[PDB]
Short mmCIF file of N, CA and C in Angstrom, two decimals:
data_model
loop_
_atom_site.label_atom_id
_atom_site.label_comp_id
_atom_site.label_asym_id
_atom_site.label_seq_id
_atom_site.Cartn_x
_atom_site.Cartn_y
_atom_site.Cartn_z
N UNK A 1 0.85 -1.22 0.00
CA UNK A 1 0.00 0.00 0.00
C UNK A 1 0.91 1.31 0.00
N UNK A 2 1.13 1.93 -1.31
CA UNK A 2 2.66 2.78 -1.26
C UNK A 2 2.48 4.37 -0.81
N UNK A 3 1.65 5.02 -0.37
CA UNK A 3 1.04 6.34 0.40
C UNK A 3 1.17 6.44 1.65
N UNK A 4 2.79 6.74 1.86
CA UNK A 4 3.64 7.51 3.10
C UNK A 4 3.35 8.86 3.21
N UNK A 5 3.73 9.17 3.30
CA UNK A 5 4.07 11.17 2.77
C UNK A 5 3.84 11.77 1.28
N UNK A 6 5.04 11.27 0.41
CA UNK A 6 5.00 11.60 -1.07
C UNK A 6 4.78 10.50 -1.89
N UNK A 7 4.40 10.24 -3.01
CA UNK A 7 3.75 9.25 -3.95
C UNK A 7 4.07 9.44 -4.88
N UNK A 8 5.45 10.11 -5.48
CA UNK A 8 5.53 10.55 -7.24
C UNK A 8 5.60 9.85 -8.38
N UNK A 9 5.14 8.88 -8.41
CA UNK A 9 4.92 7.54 -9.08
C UNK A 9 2.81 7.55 -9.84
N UNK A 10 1.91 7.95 -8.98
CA UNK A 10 0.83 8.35 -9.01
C UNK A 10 0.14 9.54 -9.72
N UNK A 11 0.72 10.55 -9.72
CA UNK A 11 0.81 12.02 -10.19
C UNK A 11 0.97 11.97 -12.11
N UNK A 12 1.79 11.12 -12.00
CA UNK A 12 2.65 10.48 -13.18
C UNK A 12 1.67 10.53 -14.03
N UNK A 13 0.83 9.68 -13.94
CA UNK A 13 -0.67 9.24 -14.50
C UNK A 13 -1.67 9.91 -15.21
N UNK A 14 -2.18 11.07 -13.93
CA UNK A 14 -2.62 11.89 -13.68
C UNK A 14 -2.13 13.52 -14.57
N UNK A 15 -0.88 13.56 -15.20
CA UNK A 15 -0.14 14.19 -15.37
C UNK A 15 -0.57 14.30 -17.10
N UNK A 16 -0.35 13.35 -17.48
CA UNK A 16 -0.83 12.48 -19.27
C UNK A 16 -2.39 12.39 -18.85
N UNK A 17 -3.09 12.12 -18.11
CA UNK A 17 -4.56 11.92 -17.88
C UNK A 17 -5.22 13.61 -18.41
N UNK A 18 -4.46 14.29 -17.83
CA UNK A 18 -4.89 15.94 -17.85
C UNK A 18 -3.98 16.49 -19.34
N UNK A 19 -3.40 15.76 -19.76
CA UNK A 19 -2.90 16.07 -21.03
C UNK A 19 -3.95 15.06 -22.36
N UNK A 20 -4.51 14.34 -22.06
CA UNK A 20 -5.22 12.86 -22.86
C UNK A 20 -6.58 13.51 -23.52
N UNK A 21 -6.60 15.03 -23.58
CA UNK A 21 -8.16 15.87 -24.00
C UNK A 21 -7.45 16.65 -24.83
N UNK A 22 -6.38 17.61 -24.71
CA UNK A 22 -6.10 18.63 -25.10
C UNK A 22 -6.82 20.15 -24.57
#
């Protein structure tokens, strides 16, 4: 379950997800 503090592995995703419309 990898959500200590920081997670920059997750964002990643999220990152191309908000780029995937234009």
């Amino acid at each position: 379950t990898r959500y200590l503090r920081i997670h920059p592995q997750s964002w990643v995703h999220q990152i191309a997800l908000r780029m995937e419309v234009l």
